[PDB]
Design an enzyme around this catalytic site. Structure first.
Site, PDB file in Angstrom:
ATOM      1  N   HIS A  40      -1.808   8.404   2.220  1.00 18.26           N
ATOM      2  CA  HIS A  40      -0.807   7.366   2.492  1.00 18.26           C
ATOM      3  C   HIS A  40      -0.272   6.721   1.200  1.00 18.26           C
ATOM      4  CE1 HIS A  40      -4.058   4.218   2.392  1.00 18.26           C
ATOM      5  NE2 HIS A  40      -3.051   3.459   1.992  1.00 18.26           N
ATOM      6  N   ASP A  84      -6.924  11.271   5.438  1.00 20.52           N
ATOM      7  CA  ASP A  84      -6.191  10.451   4.469  1.00 20.52           C
ATOM      8  C   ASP A  84      -6.700  10.698   3.047  1.00 20.52           C
ATOM      9  OD1 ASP A  84      -4.424   8.646   3.371  1.00 20.52           O
ATOM     10  OD2 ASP A  84      -5.449   6.848   4.120  1.00 20.52           O
ATOM     11  N   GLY A 175      -3.199  -2.872  -1.439  1.00 22.89           N
ATOM     12  CA  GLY A 175      -3.177  -2.589  -2.871  1.00 22.89           C
ATOM     13  C   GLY A 175      -4.439  -1.911  -3.379  1.00 22.89           C
ATOM     14  N   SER A 177      -5.741   0.471  -1.554  1.00 23.35           N
ATOM     15  CA  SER A 177      -5.491   1.798  -0.991  1.00 23.35           C
ATOM     16  C   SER A 177      -5.653   2.916  -2.001  1.00 23.35           C
ATOM     17  CB  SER A 177      -4.066   1.859  -0.449  1.00 23.35           C
ATOM     18  OG  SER A 177      -3.956   1.117   0.745  1.00 23.35           O
ATOM     19  N   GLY A 178      -6.407   3.945  -1.624  1.00 21.41           N
ATOM     20  CA  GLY A 178      -6.571   5.131  -2.455  1.00 21.41           C
ATOM     21  C   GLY A 178      -7.704   5.038  -3.458  1.00 21.41           C
TER      22      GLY A 178
END
Ligand SMILES: [Ca+2]
Length: 223
Positions: A40, A84, A175, A177-178
């Site tokens: 994402h 994801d 923020g 994320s990942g």
């Protein structure tokens, strides 16, 4: 990260910031040429920023390297966030040192109760909005599959796990994320999703990296 602590400069040497004019996602360095992040987080025009603490100031240990290609998992579903995960190749190899270092992939999946370190430059507020400049850290346990599924009926797949606190107060957020979830020196998770941040009975949900080790290795070996 909500309810965390200031990591300390370069104390999480595998943590990367993905930048497209601004920080938009975290990632994890897994060798000199490759970063793992969330699917994402996919976009074009990615610059990988390694050796960061304050993402708004050049402090002297950074390496800025453009992405040459991104590979989103073939089975990623953006509606459910199943699978994801994404790989990003650097245009040039990072110079590895004490402050810019790869994180090991798991050889086995981690269990509920395992203590992990979650990190990122995401929002630090559960209600309002405040973005830190320096890297924030959170120590959090992996939660049981049953409690995870109970928290999020109909939404937890075999490629996801919950980590954090059912009482709320401490969590990943927008923020982050990942970014990494590291447990006993292995990358077990990727910051994926949640319902708000640090809310009671809504812990963060993470991509289960141990399910993807074969895909990561074979993808790296041919790209
Ligand atoms: Ca910096």
């Amino acid at each position: 990260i909500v309810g965390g602590y200031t990591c300390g400069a370069n104390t999480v040497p595998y943590q990367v910031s993905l930048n497209s004019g601004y920080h938009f996602c975290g990632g994890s360095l897994i060798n000199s040429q490759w970063v793992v992040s969330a699917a994402h987080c996919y976009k074009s025009g990615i610059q990988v920023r390694l050796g960061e603490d304050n993402i708004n100031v050049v402090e002297g240990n950074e390496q800025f390297i453009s992405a040459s290609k991104s590979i989103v998992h073939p089975s990623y579903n953006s509606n459910t966030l199943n699978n994801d995960i994404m790989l990003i190749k650097l245009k040039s190899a990072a110079s590895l040192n004490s402050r810019v270092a790869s994180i090991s992939l798991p050889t086995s999946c981690a269990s509920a109760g395992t203590q992990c370190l979650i990190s990122g430059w995401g929002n630090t507020k559960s209600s309002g909005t405040s973005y830190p400049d320096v890297l924030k850290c959170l120590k959090a346990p992996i939660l049981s599959d049953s409690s995870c599924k109970s928290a999020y009926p109909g939404q937890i797949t075999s490629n996801m796990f919950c980590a954090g606190y059912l009482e709320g107060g401490k969590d990943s957020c927008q923020g982050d994320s990942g970014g990494p979830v590291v447990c006993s020196g292995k990358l077990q998770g990727i910051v994926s999703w949640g319902s708000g941040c640090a809310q009671k009975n809504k812990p963060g949900v993470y991509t289960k990296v141990c399910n993807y080790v074969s895909w990561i290795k074979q993808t790296i070996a041919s790209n």
